[PDB]
Design a protein around this ligand. Structure first.
Ligand SMILES: [Mg+2]
Ligand SMILES: [Mg+2]
Ligand SMILES: [Mg+2]
Ligand SMILES: [Mg+2]
Ligand SMILES: [Mg+2]
Ligand SMILES: [Mg+2]
Ligand SMILES: [Mg+2]
Ligand SMILES: [Mg+2]
Ligand SMILES: [Mg+2]
Ligand SMILES: [Mg+2]
Ligand SMILES: [Mg+2]
Ligand SMILES: [Mg+2]
Ligand SMILES: [Mg+2]
Ligand SMILES: [Mg+2]
Ligand SMILES: [Mg+2]
Ligand SMILES: [Mg+2]
Ligand SMILES: [Mg+2]
Ligand SMILES: [Mg+2]
Ligand SMILES: [Mg+2]
Ligand SMILES: [Mg+2]
Ligand SMILES: [Mg+2]
Ligand SMILES: [Mg+2]
Ligand SMILES: [Mg+2]
Ligand SMILES: [Mg+2]
Ligand SMILES: [Mg+2]
Ligand SMILES: [Mg+2]
Ligand SMILES: [Mg+2]
Ligand SMILES: [Mg+2]
Ligand SMILES: [Mg+2]
Ligand SMILES: [Mg+2]
Ligand SMILES: [Mg+2]
Ligand SMILES: [Mg+2]
Ligand SMILES: [Mg+2]
Ligand SMILES: [Mg+2]
Ligand SMILES: [Mg+2]
Ligand SMILES: [Mg+2]
Ligand SMILES: [Mg+2]
Ligand SMILES: [Mg+2]
Ligand SMILES: [Mg+2]
Ligand SMILES: [Mg+2]
Ligand SMILES: [Mg+2]
Ligand SMILES: [Mg+2]
Ligand SMILES: [Mg+2]
Ligand SMILES: [Mg+2]
Ligand SMILES: [Mg+2]
Ligand SMILES: [Mg+2]
Ligand SMILES: [Mg+2]
Ligand SMILES: [Mg+2]
Ligand SMILES: [Mg+2]
Ligand SMILES: [Mg+2]
Ligand SMILES: [Mg+2]
Ligand SMILES: [Mg+2]
Ligand SMILES: [Mg+2]
Ligand SMILES: [Mg+2]
Ligand SMILES: [Mg+2]
Ligand SMILES: [Mg+2]
Ligand SMILES: [Mg+2]
Ligand SMILES: [Mg+2]
Ligand SMILES: [Mg+2]
Ligand SMILES: [Mg+2]
Ligand SMILES: [Mg+2]
Ligand SMILES: [Mg+2]
Ligand SMILES: [Mg+2]
Ligand SMILES: [Mg+2]
Ligand SMILES: [Mg+2]
Ligand SMILES: [Zn+2]
Lengths: 151, 63
RNA sequence: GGGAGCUUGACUGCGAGACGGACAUGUCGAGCAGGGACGAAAGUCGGGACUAGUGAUCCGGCACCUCUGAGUGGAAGGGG
RNA sequence: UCGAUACGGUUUGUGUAGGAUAGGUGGGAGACUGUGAAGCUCACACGCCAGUGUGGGUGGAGUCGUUGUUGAAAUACCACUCUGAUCGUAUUGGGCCUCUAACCUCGGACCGUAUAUCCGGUUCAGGGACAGUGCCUGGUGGGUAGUUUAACUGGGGCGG
RNA sequence: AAAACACAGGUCCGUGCGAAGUCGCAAGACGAUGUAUACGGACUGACGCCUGCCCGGUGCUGGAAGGUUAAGAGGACCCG
RNA sequence: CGUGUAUGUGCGUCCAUGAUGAAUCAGCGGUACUAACCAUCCAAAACCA
RNA sequence: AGCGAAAGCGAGUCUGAAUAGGGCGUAUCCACACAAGAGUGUGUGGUGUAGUGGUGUGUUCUGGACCCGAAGCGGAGUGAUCUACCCAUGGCCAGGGUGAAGCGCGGGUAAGACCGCGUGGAGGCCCGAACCCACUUAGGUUGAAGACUGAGGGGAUGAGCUGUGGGUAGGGGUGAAAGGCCAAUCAAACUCCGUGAUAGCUGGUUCUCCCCGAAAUGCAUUUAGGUGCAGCGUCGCAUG
RNA sequence: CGUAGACGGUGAGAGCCCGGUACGUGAAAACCCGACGUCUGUCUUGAUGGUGUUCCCGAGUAGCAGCGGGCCCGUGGAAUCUGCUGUGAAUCUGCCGGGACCACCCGGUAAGCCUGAAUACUUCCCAGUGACCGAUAGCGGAUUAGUACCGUGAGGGAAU
RNA sequence: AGCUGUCAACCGAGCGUUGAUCCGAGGAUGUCCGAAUGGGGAAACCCGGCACGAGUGAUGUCGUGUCACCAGGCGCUGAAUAUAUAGGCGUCUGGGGGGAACGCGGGGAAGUGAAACAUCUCAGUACCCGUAGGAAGAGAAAACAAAAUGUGAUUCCGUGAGUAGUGGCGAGCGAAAGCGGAGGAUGGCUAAACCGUAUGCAUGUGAUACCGGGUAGGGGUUGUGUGUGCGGGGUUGUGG
């Protein structure tokens, strides 16, 4: 199995190194944990992007979580979408968690991971202000207001 | 335990052959392994019966 | 039957004509050629005075041969 | 923790003519020294205790070459290598101890679930690359199955 | 219809727990909602007095210093 | 066991009679952030033989 | 067109060193030479070669193969309304005896052990109907009955008997064990199917006349009551 | 009489007595086969050279190995095809077949899919035929026949 | 122009030239059981929910619809638990069972033969399982062939041939090429390279980008990796 590392693992190599491991090692450990990606046409670029993104998005302590909360709740954001005629308000699909994260960043906010965004619970199907809860930590939830606007 | 849930791989039937050439019916079972497979990155696992061939080919995934 | 000299016919290619007889087996054979032994020569020698000491076919082994060789040259395998 | 090979290096060669424990071979008339030699006092390895390589201190200006020998020369220096002793870089197998992440738990809790000692999921607590299960392989195997176990004969059996 | 079986009582062997055993291709079930004072198998057969000698043979239990031994590894050398 | 109508007694949602109990301000002691008080144990650095 | 294992050669070919001798082949006959009386052969000439496709009959091959008959062997189903054992839930056991433990009282003792007398009502306890068995005997034996009847016999509060409902299925069940029992059938049930199973064995195989007419021996045989070949019959052709 | 002398029936062998027969004729509706339209697609720039260590040409696949299956082929010198279990390639100088295998030639272009006709059969419906049966025959069943009856059941199963 | 099916008449009543009986086609009605499907059940008999209507003084009662399970679309919700998912609601569309033979794909005997028997045979037969269709399967060369200037998808029939061979070389088993016919479609469509577009997942705020030159302007992130879908392009062996 041929892998490109996205983190430093001891006795294997450094982030970005191409390594050949036993199938059991990669399939049951490195790949589940996201320490490596399968070697592929774009894998060198993807592995560097993954590691740099992780270091920016990671949250460490409940103190950092409360700092993120108090920063994030001080904002109101704009999400841009492609939508039906105004009377329906129906969007031509659905806001993704990646849209919410990139909108929060584009509006001068933290770089959060997308799995923290409780988007399904927001039930955003039309256009207008919609509150979305972001779970920074088990005890730290921030509420953010998104405008959804036709592009 | 002789049928793969992904590709449908079943057992083959044939003969065991004695030194004296006595032919007795036997099966060739697929090597299917219990795997706790996932469906999306970082999701709930579901126990399935996958053949070793599907595991080797990456048709089942883990977390 | 007893003794002595030399020797390898305890041969290769063959075999007119017979014995025996359910069949398969078995048995005798003069004589022709090759290349030899002994003998001065005539000649005798295809094991042992004679009749037991043995086992069909299949399958397979080994040596040799101017046979065959699955498109062709080889080879494997198969023939003699 | 062993074991095969490879690659970086080092140890180590008693025909006799002999300055003498003659490596076969090529570049071979000059090296080795003050980034400190001849000559000794010790530590270490082998041992045919003949004597070799080596570290430190001391010493301070050599041993040297066709030198004649010798099939074969210089322990003046440089190259791959071989009788064999070894160390680290790889490659690759055997055993052993661990780790967690595959896999396992008829161990706990919680959820699907109003109902539920089924089942599945989540999680905690334990096993753990073992076990279980494919494929391949050697054993044990009247537990079971298909069958065989002659004829002659003053009936058959026994004897022959 | 018994002198046979069963029997209470005895001894041995197995079983540390979805045990051993059994039914089933498995899942699962019985064993048992039991836990070695229990459960299964074997022989003996209330009770009384007793139950000697042999471990060469064949089983069972444990051991592994030797002899032998599969597939898997290896792959010299040889042949087309 | 059910169903409908009628009649008569008390019981009541709103009216109201009886019934309880909790937040919070303010006056007080022992938990006790924290600098200390008291009792006790040990020797880094260590002096001497 | 044959010969040869074949390459291949061809009225020849194979074996072989042979122009040796044999093997197989050149339809069959006739004449004439030339060699042989070792069985006659070798050359010339002539004469010429008979097959194949329908269809009758006899035998034979593969099929049920002239017809009838096993015990048994598979595949798939059906059965625990009989019987064996088990599970759940009900019922039944006249009458009469015996007198365990425990308890109480009185002897006895320092207290006991122990010993009388009551009370008590134990037990795969006793006698004996129902009920459940089937020990002996007589009868029945083309029965009244495919297992019974009469007379006696055993158990009869228990490892009891019994109703209802249920469960275990064939190499399987169940069995206080007789290979017992599993629907009058059990050393492997029943039914349908493979299937017209297979029998070197037994039985059977139907109108007529005319001619001929055996064998019961030899050899071999997982053979001895089977079969092959020979011997002996018959029909046809040839030779007389 | 006959384009009718098929076959039945009718009081006994009927072309001319009857139902018919030869030959003609006929469908409101439904169904089936066409044709023709609508309607639906699709196309409308093609021929022609050059050029190249450029890219592509069906991957857990081919190949290989173990154990099997199946092929005339019973493991055999055993190709070709194929299941399971391991191992695991090349994109045209590629790869796979030409009965082990190798070389050289020849054929073909695997691991994507669809495809009418020639072939097999008849529960059922229509029209016919027989050197087929004629009531112990022919279907088990010309008669209430899978009935009566037998068996717990599967199933067996008449007679007139 | 006669009828009221028949065994099957007898009685008792009626229809039909205003066209009956009868024959053909299309509709209506079609209790209960049965896949059986509201729930249950010893098939054909027991008990219901909901909606609408009828009937009661009201209860009871009576019509007519509808209510199983599973699979797959579409919508809502998203447990333990955060992302979510399992699941839960709602709704639409299907499937289920039967049928004599014929097809395809799987599983797969034994009697028997070998005069015993195990290899082998019987036989891939009997039976069984999964699925069809009016036929099915197969089919458009990773084919044969043998140096012929060969044939050219598949299937089926006749030959080749009881041959080559195979076989306890026993009993037995047994091709293919080639050639003669039936049929006509030597038939079609796709995957990749490379363009375009949509959109998932990473990035980026600067180059890039906006069909391509030569440019002249402009616009400013429209960008840049990689995956997937839908259109162009590409359907081939002399290689394309
Ligand atoms: Mg692996
Ligand atoms: Mg098979
Ligand atoms: Mg067999
Ligand atoms: Mg003499
Ligand atoms: Mg000799
Ligand atoms: Mg002779
Ligand atoms: Mg003799
Ligand atoms: Mg001579
Ligand atoms: Mg002689
Ligand atoms: Mg002599
Ligand atoms: Mg033999
Ligand atoms: Mg050849
Ligand atoms: Mg060849
Ligand atoms: Mg040879
Ligand atoms: Mg030979
Ligand atoms: Mg293991
Ligand atoms: Mg036996
Ligand atoms: Mg048999
Ligand atoms: Mg005898
Ligand atoms: Mg005798
Ligand atoms: Mg004897
Ligand atoms: Mg008796
Ligand atoms: Mg006991
Ligand atoms: Mg167990
Ligand atoms: Mg014992
Ligand atoms: Mg006893
Ligand atoms: Mg032992
Ligand atoms: Mg038998
Ligand atoms: Mg039977
Ligand atoms: Mg039953
Ligand atoms: Mg008693
Ligand atoms: Mg009895
Ligand atoms: Mg009598
Ligand atoms: Mg009596
Ligand atoms: Mg009495
Ligand atoms: Mg008595
Ligand atoms: Mg009594
Ligand atoms: Mg009692
Ligand atoms: Mg019952
Ligand atoms: Mg007995
Ligand atoms: Mg009986
Ligand atoms: Mg039997
Ligand atoms: Mg048969
Ligand atoms: Mg018979
Ligand atoms: Mg006579
Ligand atoms: Mg005879
Ligand atoms: Mg007539
Ligand atoms: Mg291709
Ligand atoms: Mg085979
Ligand atoms: Mg090949
Ligand atoms: Mg097809
Ligand atoms: Mg008659
Ligand atoms: Mg009849
Ligand atoms: Mg019966
Ligand atoms: Mg009946
Ligand atoms: Mg129902
Ligand atoms: Mg039901
Ligand atoms: Mg959630
Ligand atoms: Mg169906
Ligand atoms: Mg036999
Ligand atoms: Mg026989
Ligand atoms: Mg088709
Ligand atoms: Mg042959
Ligand atoms: Mg495309
Ligand atoms: Mg070509
Ligand atoms: Zn699989």
């Amino acid at each position: 199995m041929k892998l490109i590392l996205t983190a430093e693992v001891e006795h294997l190599g450094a982030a970005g190194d191409t390594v050949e491991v036993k199938d059991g090692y990669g399939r049951n450990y490195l790949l589940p944990r996201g320490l490596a990606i399968v070697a592929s046409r774009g894998a060198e670029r993807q592995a560097e992007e993954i590691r740099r993104a992780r270091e920016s998005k990671v949250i460490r302590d409940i103190e950092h979580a409360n700092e993120l909360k108090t920063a994030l709740e001080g904002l109101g954001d704009v999400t841009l979408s492609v939508n039906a005629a105004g009377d329906t308000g129906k969007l031509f699909g659905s806001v993704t968690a990646a849209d919410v994260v990139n909108a929060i960043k584009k509006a001068g906010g933290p770089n959060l991971d997308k799995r923290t965004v409780q988007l399904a619970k927001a039930h955003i199907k039309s256009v207008g202000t919609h509150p979305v809860t972001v779970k920074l930590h088990t005890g730290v939830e921030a509420k953010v207001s998104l405008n959804v606007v036709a592009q | 335990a002789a049928v793969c849930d992904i590709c449908g791989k079943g057992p083959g039937f044939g003969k065991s052959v004695s030194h004296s050439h006595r032919r007795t019916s036997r099966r060739w079972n697929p090597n299917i392994q219990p795997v706790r497979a996932v469906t999306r990155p970082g999701g709930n696992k579901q126990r399935i019966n996958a053949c070793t061939s599907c595991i080797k080919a990456g048709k089942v995934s883990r977390a």
